[PDB]
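for ur thesis appendix - V-type ATP synthase alpha chain. copy paste whatever u need, i formatted it the way the template wanted (i think)
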Amino acid sequence: PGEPVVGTGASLSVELGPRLLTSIYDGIQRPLEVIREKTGDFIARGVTAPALPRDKKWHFIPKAKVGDKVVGGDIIGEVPETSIIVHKIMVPPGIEGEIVEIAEEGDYTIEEVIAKVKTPSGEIKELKMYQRWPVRVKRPYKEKLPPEVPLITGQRVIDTFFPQAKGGTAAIPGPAGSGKTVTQHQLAKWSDAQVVIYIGCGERGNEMTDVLEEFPKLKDPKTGKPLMERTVLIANTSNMPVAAREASIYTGITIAEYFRDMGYDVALMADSTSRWAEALPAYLASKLAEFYERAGRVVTLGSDYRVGSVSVIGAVSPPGGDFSEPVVQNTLRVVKVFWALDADLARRRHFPAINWLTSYSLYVDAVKDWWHKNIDPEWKAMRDKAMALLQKESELQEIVRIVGPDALPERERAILLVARMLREDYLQQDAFDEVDTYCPPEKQVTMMRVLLNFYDKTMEAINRGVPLEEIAKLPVREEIGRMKFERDVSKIRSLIDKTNEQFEELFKKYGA
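the 3d part is after this line
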């Protein structure tokens, strides 16, 4: 509306209800292009359009009845919104009491009052299929849970060495381009979040166009349905007001929090480094912080025990291609994970071009018990071992650069052989391949066991006089290089026995 009050200005809010999905907005949730506003401490002014259509009929299913006691977050109905997502109709935060009136199953437009609640006062509150929330106010919840369950991306280098927790905070520094774009796209479509809130575009120039024309064609690989049906986009464009681009990340995170309150895992993804806007280094630092602080996995409001999360992934691309700060350095300081895309790795044709020495995740210990309990009790021991091999490989390659390869002992040559297999057979991954576009957790640990078992057999064999050239030509080495294209994890698993057997024949052949 247009009401003015002391403190934060015209309370800038979003409409939360059905039809949000598949929608594209600007920084303050207008369907249109353009935008208009004056961001300050004091206030902000804006008029035009409706965020949610009032014309569309929604199929309402009641999930409560007259006489039920309710609190904020209680689910009182369901609406099938898209062919992917069921919209859960919740009591707005701050409302409690008895349901004295609830709609029957029928078709309704969003201004229709689908229930009434009598509060303890006796005051009668009318509930609709949508609700409103100030974007600068974090939606409430019962409890923020410590990081614990991984957001599974299906990308080996991430899930294994640099994991993201559901509710966690990630950034992707490094050069913009196909690399970043492909990784962004793999994350959005493969991560086990049900809903994606995507902020950006505006970064390229032809980008708004490609979004307008290609994004409706993209499929959700999980369902074969349009990805648009689990997505909401917020566009920050060069023509749009400074004020609104400022606000877009609050709009974004409020909409994400609303889907978490229903019990979904949501991924909030940002790719709007350049277009982010400033009216008037501590200003940037505080705004980054207030945003990232809102990520989290929570026990939601409601009378049933229920958990949802917002995981934040922010692409950070230097404004003028400038390696240095500020945007880059503060954001890396706030997030708990980053995936450093690296142009030299791209030129070595190592894809995805995630530098496994400069990336880091502070969630390894937080997610390990989940991996241990659900997938493989050796997950953490194996990641640590593979990383130590990579760390060793890097020190050796530096030494070798200076003194040459000709006086390397067999043990050191073997380390290099196996590190190379780790980099090519495991870290490298093919987003374009119909099998290797996603790697299930059970496949990740099984490929890793195959590789680490090969390493152990390699060092045992070195130890017993087998020459390294023989290990390098072992037929099984080359099936290991193809494990990633195999859909059937038991065929991958059998490489362990196959490896043991070929090494045995090498032992018989040397009397070793």
